RNA sequence: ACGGCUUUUCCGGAGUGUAAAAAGCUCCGGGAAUAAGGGCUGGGCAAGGCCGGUGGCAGCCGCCGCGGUAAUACCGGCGGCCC
RNA sequence: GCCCGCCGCCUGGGGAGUACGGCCGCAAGGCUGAAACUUAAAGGAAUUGGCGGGGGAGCACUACAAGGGGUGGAGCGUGCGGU
RNA sequence: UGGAGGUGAUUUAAAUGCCA
């Protein structure tokens, strides 16, 4: 955990921020990822995450879901430009997902990985199945649903050891977030990975929109963010 | 649009009738209870047949292709009907003589029917005089009856 | 000398009477039986055949009656050139 | 005559008002000429 | 390529087994000796950017789709992949 | 839009609202209504462009309007098709 | 800023398109 902890010490000098959160961070005031979120800020500098989540760039916490080239016609032929979809996250409690556009594949990948750090969220984990009744953060705490495009998803808790039973580009997103067991039930057209990816993302977000009592917490084990890494 | 029609507690009969009556608008279930494949089917519920050749022909391929596909006209035994079969392999049409007892399979396309560019052929030869056409086409074995 | 589509192999000489349609050409050869030529796909693009064009075709050993198949045409610099050698007599074109 | 509005759409076909009129002229012959 | 080793399987032989046989099982003598094919190799779908034929012809193709004289897709050889 | 009732209709495109059989009407015609077979798409809402014998704005003697000189008819110089 | 209706008018003739 060292090379990804001197990285922040190198970055924290050559970076003279322009927004305000940049000032707060660079003056040692704000010092932990769990305290820029539930407060209504804006995030426009992608160096803030390199300093508080320095592992988000480790090439095994990165992922390239799809690449597709699109076209528009003109009186001098066709003008073709790419579209990439990419997700990033430490495999603990935080994820982000973005798109990016360009006219070559390294530039589209670069912008995608950028915009995937400015779209980051934290989730809730637990164990809410009927079979397993331990208290460990390996699964969703209770069934949630999220919709997008024309694609409805629903994520159901599952017992420890059963893998991830969902589509192909759901496994990457749910593995980068820390979830390890789940079930699933979908509808609509699940062949357009943009909409399928955005529905899974929205469900994971909606995880933290359900009201819980201070006693339901010590029955599912709900951890928010990291949980003793 | 309302909610859904017979959602009562003592409304079983109307519900079962609704479902039984709208199951017939299907086409795979209808084609099965009436047994319509049979009595329109020259092979009569079988996975092979044996016939006696009558002649040798060739067909034109589809619109965006070019060539002629060799084929034969087989006359069955258990019925007496006439079907058109297709000889697969490079140089098979050089073994099928007249007055041969050939065997006949499907061709494996969509819905059991035809496939590829050959549009109306739906049977393919496998055995000629009880020697697998596959072998004959590539050496490896000798042919009986001349 | 000259490279001309002579009868090579088993070729036939096609001089057509009428196009019933969709590529069928009734041909009138020195053989006698009504032959009905059809066309491959390599030439249906760049060439242009009509009546009076003596051309070359190829027949098929099946029934030897209504056969023939275009493989190559003739240009106006050959159709009457082929008279002096007498390789073909043109009175198979006026009766 | 239990019509279906998908066929007035004129895309790759001819007018329906004039197809019906031609189905009728055949049902008049299959009936007179020994449709008895 | 040299050195050693084993005998499940394989040949003979003795008990036992069985209504009588046969298989089987326990002991002996020989010997690494007697024993791998089938389908795929363009994408879906693991696996070659190699060689020689074929020239809209021959052929392939569950669907999309290759072949027009510079074929990773047809026919072979050499490599490789799944059981 | 979120809920509590009841009834009618839909199941890829054609074949076909056709054939056969019934009940109505004086006739035209109405209501009910399949299978063989054929086919990989048929359909919907929006986006860049191109086009219109659609609309506005602006142009240009390889456009016109106002003008000056002509080529097209005869003979020769030279290039092309054909023979 | 932006739309929905109504009444009027709308002008000689002018057809067709290998192959990749
Ligand atoms: Mg409709
Ligand atoms: Mg090979
Ligand atoms: Mg592969
Ligand atoms: Mg036109
Ligand atoms: Zn658990």
Curated annotation (Swiss-Prot), chain A:
Keyword Ribonucleoprotein assigned: yes
One example of a Gene Ontology biological process annotation: translation
The record's note on its domains: The N-terminal domain interacts with the head of the 30S subunit; the C-terminal domain interacts with the body and contacts protein S4. The interaction surface between S4 and S5 is involved in control of translational fidelity.
Keyword RNA-binding: yes
NCBIfam families attached to this UniProt entry: PRK04044.1 (NF003125), uS5_euk_arch (TIGR01020)
Oligomer and partners: Part of the 30S ribosomal subunit. Contacts protein S4.
Function field: With S4 and S12 plays an important role in translational accuracy.
GO annotations of cellular component type: cytosolic small ribosomal subunit
Pfam families: Ribosomal_S5, Ribosomal_S5_C
GO molecular function terms listed in the Swiss-Prot or TrEMBL record: rRNA binding; structural constituent of ribosome
Family: Belongs to the universal ribosomal protein uS5 family.
Annotated S5 DRBM domain residues: 60-123
SUPFAM superfamilies reported in the protein's UniProt record: dsRNA-binding domain-like (SSF54768), Ribosomal protein S5 domain 2-like (SSF54211)
Protein name: Small ribosomal subunit protein uS5
PROSITE patterns found in the cross-reference section: RIBOSOMAL_S5, S5_DSRBD
Keywords: Ribonucleoprotein, Ribosomal protein, RNA-binding, rRNA-binding
Alphabetized InterPro entries for the sequence: Ribosomal_Su5_D2-typ_SF, Ribosomal_uS5, Ribosomal_uS5_arc, Ribosomal_uS5_C, Ribosomal_uS5_euk/arc, Ribosomal_uS5_N, Ribosomal_uS5_N_CS, Ribsml_uS5_D2-typ_fold_subgr
Species of provenance: Pyrococcus abyssi (strain GE5 / Orsay)
From Swiss-Prot, chain B:
Top-level taxon of the source organism: Archaea
TM regions (residue ranges): none
Annotated keywords: Ribonucleoprotein, Ribosomal protein, RNA-binding, rRNA-binding
A single GO cellular-component term on record: small ribosomal subunit
Record-level GO BP terms: translation
Signal peptide stretch: none
GO MF annotation, one: rRNA binding
Presence of keyword Transport: no
UniProt xrefs under InterPro entries: NA-bd_OB-fold, Ribosomal_uS12, Ribosomal_uS12_arc, Ribosomal_uS12_euk/arc
Summary of the function given for this chain in its UniProt record: With S4 and S5 plays an important role in translational accuracy. Located at the interface of the 30S and 50S subunits.
Protein family: Belongs to the universal ribosomal protein uS12 family.
Family matches, as NCBIfam families: PRK04211.1, uS12_E_A
PANTHER family named in the record: 30S RIBOSOMAL PROTEIN S12 FAMILY MEMBER
This protein's name: Small ribosomal subunit protein uS12
Protein species of origin: Pyrococcus abyssi (strain GE5 / Orsay)
UniProtKB/Swiss-Prot annotation, chain C:
Annotated signal peptide: none
Record domain S1-like: where: 1-75
GO molecular function, one term: RNA binding
Protein biosynthesis as UniProt keyword: yes
Superkingdom to which the source organism belongs: Archaea
Keywords: Initiation factor, Protein biosynthesis
Keyword Protein biosynthesis among record annotations: yes
Protein role: Seems to be required for maximal rate of protein biosynthesis. Enhances ribosome dissociation into subunits and stabilizes the binding of the initiator Met-tRNA(I) to 40 S ribosomal subunits.
Family recorded in the similarity comment: Belongs to the eIF-1A family.
Protein name: Translation initiation factor 1A
Species the sequence originates in: Pyrococcus abyssi (strain GE5 / Orsay)
Organism ancestry: Archaea, Methanobacteriati, Methanobacteriota, Thermococci, Thermococcales
Residue range from the parent sequence: 13 to 107 of 113
